[PDB]
Structure formats: C-alpha cells, structure tokens
From a paper:
The cofactor-free and AdoMet-bound proteins were crystallized at different conditions. Both structures were determined by means of molecular replacement, and refined to 3.0 Å and 3.1 Å, respectively. Four and eight protein monomers resided in the asymmetric units of the two crystal structures. The two structures are very similar to each other and could be well overlaid with an RMSD of 0.76 Å on 191 Cα atoms. The catalytic motif DPPY lies in a loop connecting αD and β4, and the cofactor AdoMet binds in a neighboring cavity. The cofactor binding pocket of M1.HpyAVI is surrounded by residues 7-9, 29-31, 165-167, 216-218 and 221, which are conserved among most of DNA MTases. A hydrogen bond between D29 in the catalytic motif DPPY and the amino group of bound AdoMet is preserved as other MTase structures. Residues D8 and A9 from hydrogen-bonds with N6 and N1 of the purine ring, respectively, and E216 also locates at hydrogen bonding distance with O2′ and O3′ of the ribose. In addition, H168, T200 and S198 contact the terminal carboxyl of AdoMet. The phenyl ring of F195 forms a perpendicular π-stacking interaction with the purine ring of AdoMet, which stabilizes the orientation of AdoMet bound in the pocket of M1.HpyAVI.
M1.HpyAVI is a DNA adenine MTase that belongs to the type II R-M system. M1.HpyAVI encoded by ORF hp0050 is an N6-adenine methyltransferase belonging to the β-class MTase. It has been reported recently that this enzyme recognizes the sequence of 5′-GAGG-3′, 5′-GGAG-3′ or 5′-GAAG-3′ and methylates adenines in these sequences. The structural basis and the catalytic mechanism underlying such a distinct activity are not well understood due to the lack of an available 3D structure of this enzyme.Here, we report the crystal structure of M1.HpyAVI from H. pylori 26695, which is the first determined N6-adenine MTase structure in H. pylori.
Author numbering:
A (entry chain B): 1 to 31, 59 to 156, 165 to 229
B (entry chain A): 1 to 32, 59 to 168, 173 to 231
Write the structure that this text describes.
C-alpha cells in the first residue's frame, strides 16, 4: 500500500492516534525548534519489533539519540552516507562536506530487522554518486536503508517525506509506504513520482 | 620538546593558569552528574588566538561537545573520523560492525587556523588504518598513524600540542616523530609510565 497525506505531521498524529495506527518502521528525514517533539508523538505508532531511522546533523545527533531513549527506544547505531562528488567549498582551509548522518534506533524490548546479504560486516551503507527539492535524499540510499532495516512487506512511515523518495524506495522494494507532507508542491512532486 | 606530567588534569590546570602556559593546539582523547565537558571550559584559555582543538568522542557525546565548545569561544569547523580495516567483528548477523572512531575539530573564534592540505586534494576521513599490534599496549582506550595524520593536518611543525588525557601517550609519540613539541598529562601511573617509556624517559 501507498498512501500520502498532505498535512502537518503534528496535527495529523491525532487522527493516527484514534485510528490506532501502527507502523513497523519510521524512516524519515526531518527538517524554538523541536524536531524532538515529533519523535515523542510518533513513537507510540511503532510495533514492538519495530525501529526508527532518522536523518540528522551531527550537531543534533546526540540529542536525538538521548531523546529517543527516553521514549522507549534503544539507539543501536549511526548510519552515514557519502557522495562521490562533493561540490568543493573552501577546499584549502577546511574539509569538504561529503557526509550525511542518520540514527538507527529500535524499540526497547524489540527483536529487530537487520538483513545482511551473504557478505560481511557494514556501516557505511553506500558509495552513491532528479528532483527540484532543496534537500532530497537520494533513492539508492533510501533503498539500501530499507532493504536493511525492513522486511519484504513491513509498514514504513515517513512523516516528513519531501519529494517522497522514501516511498519510492518502498514501492520498488514492495515495502508498504505511508507518508506526510505539509506543503503542496512537494506533496504533488511525491505524488506523481508515485 | 616533550614534557609529561602525572597529575589529575583538573588539578594541574590551575598550575598552568599562573605558570601562564600557552599551548597552540589541544589534541586529546578524553575518557567516557558529569559533565566531563568542563575540562573544555577550563582548558580553553590556554589556546593561542590561531589555535584549535581536536576532541575524540562518541557520536553520543559529539553534539554536546560541539555546543559547549562554541559557548567557550570556539567555532566548530567540522568533524573528523577514522575507520578500522580490521573490525573484530561482533554481532554481525544482528548488527552493524563497529569500525568507526569520531573526533571533533574546533578552532578559536577569530583564529587563522592551520589545516594544511597536501597538494593532493580532499577528505574528511583522515585515515582508514589496520588497528594497533606491536605498538599495541595494555590499554583499551588505545591508532598512531591516525594521530600523526591528525597532527600533520591541524598543526604545524613547531607548534605546542597538549593532550590533558594522554593515555598511553600516542599523541606525544606522534608529535615526536613529526617534531611537534608535546605536553601531556595522565592520572594513572601504569598509563603514565608506559607513555613515559614510549617517549624515552
Ligand atoms: C528536509 S526535507 C526531506 C525531504 C525528503 N527526505 C526527500 O527525499 O525529498 C523535510 C520535508 O518535510 C516537510 N515538512 C516541514 N514541516 C512539516 C510538517 N510540519 N508536517 C509535515 N511535513 C513537513 C518539508 O516540506 C520538507 O520538504
Ligand atoms: C580515552 S583515554 C586516551 C588514550 C590515548 N589517546 C591513547 O591512545 O593511549 C583517556 C585517559 O585519560 C586518563 N584520565 C582519566 N582522568 C584523568 C584526569 N582527571 N586527568 C588526566 N587524565 C585522566 C585515563 O587514565 C585514560 O587513560
């Protein structure tokens, strides 16, 4: 199944509460700032064996990890993605920025999903190199995230979906996506890409 | 130059205060209520106008360290990171292997900092090394080529590098081979003396 809503994630959670909605994994790329709050409100929706994968900057990453663990989750690890072709800035005075961070947490007593192909170890999921969106996470990245932390059909929820691409990864992997967007141009971008 | 002290860093910082000690770069690997973020507040005054800090941390502490650093008059430029060629591995089938070590790079606020990129172009992952063997000693917080690359980048040959928690002295030894003028402190004597034997008494 694929459902996209054009809504504010913070008010639409009340509808999901009454409906007793329960999703397997929350895989999202979030944008006086909380941003820790949505986590508190979307945490109840996760099934006992479920997990979260949350994109974040390293400036916020420790906060989110600690916050997650106050909400009944255990932060298992970090995942990260590197582009092969950074547009270089201040090459001589500073490190180029090729890296994107995400946090992987699971529910506290959960028996979670991992899925390693016959192969060994892990932890930099991808080597990777479309939309008009300002910040879009790529498809191949999202597809790998999903192949790992979810199973052939699980219910994946992305409260901030942007251009989608969390869904598109789910659709291609047959992963049952639900997603939300507040603004109309992004919602429709996500909609016809699906 | 190489000088090592055996002391509690929080106890020796007062001595450094009145001794008017000034160090160019604090490159350290701290240990992990508290608030072992405070040493940062206390060791900040010792850093020269153009100086910098490099602080090893878990991704669980990295955001805290970053914000505190920037409250003490430093600007966080970036993070640096190291990957082992040889993870053990542990808990493979159920989990990610642990191959990574994180550190934070900040500079004093209006500083003209060092960096030093070789004519060779980019990253952000100073080194993927093999993890220590016959340089490997007796301590679990223990790597050298990493410290040498960290130093080759964020310091210049005659600068003064301070490691308030020096552990086995892997920062001192790196400084020595790169001719970098090391100062270091250690609380434990088995660690202090090993470092002392690594830097040639
Ligand atoms: C940082 S972007 C991530 C984009 C997405 N990961 C992609 O691949 O394109 C987060 C998105 O969440 C949307 N958003 C912001 N506030 C929201 C809210 N209150 N409720 C639902 N969506 C929101 C924004 O429109 C933004 O495009
Ligand atoms: C993470 S280890 C650093 C090890 C070192 N980087 C190495 O490669 O060998 C931190 C060290 O700081 C020491 N330590 C703990 N408290 C200290 C203090 N108050 N002052 C100085 N050193 C301390 C510990 O004994 C430990 O050896």
């Amino acid at each position: 199944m694929i459902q996209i809503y054009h809504a504010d994630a913070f008010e639409i959670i009340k509808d999901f509460y009454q409906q007793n909605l329960k999703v397997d994994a929350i895989i999202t790329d979030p944008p006086n700032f909380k941003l820790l709050e949505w986590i508190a409100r979307y945490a109840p929706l996760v099934n006992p064996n479920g997990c979260m994968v949350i994109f974040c900057s390293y400036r916020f990453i420790s906060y989110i990890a600690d916050f997650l663990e106050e909400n009944g989750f255990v932060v298992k690890d970090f995942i990260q993605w590197v582009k092969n072709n950074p547009m270089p800035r201040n090459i001589h005075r500073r490190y180029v920025q090729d890296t994107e961070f995400a946090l992987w947490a699971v529910k506290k007593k959960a028996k979670w999903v991992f899925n390693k192909p016959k192969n060994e170890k892990y932890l930099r999921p991808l080597i990777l190199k479309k939309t008009k969106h300002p910040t879009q996470k790529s498809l191949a990245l999202m597809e790998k995230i999903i192949s790992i932390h979810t199973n052939p059909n699980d219910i994946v929820l992305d409260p901030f979906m942007g251009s989608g691409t969390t869904g598109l990864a789910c659709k291609n992997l047959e992963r049952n996506f639900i997603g939300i967007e507040s603004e109309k141009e992004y919602f429709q971008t996500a909609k016809k890409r699906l």
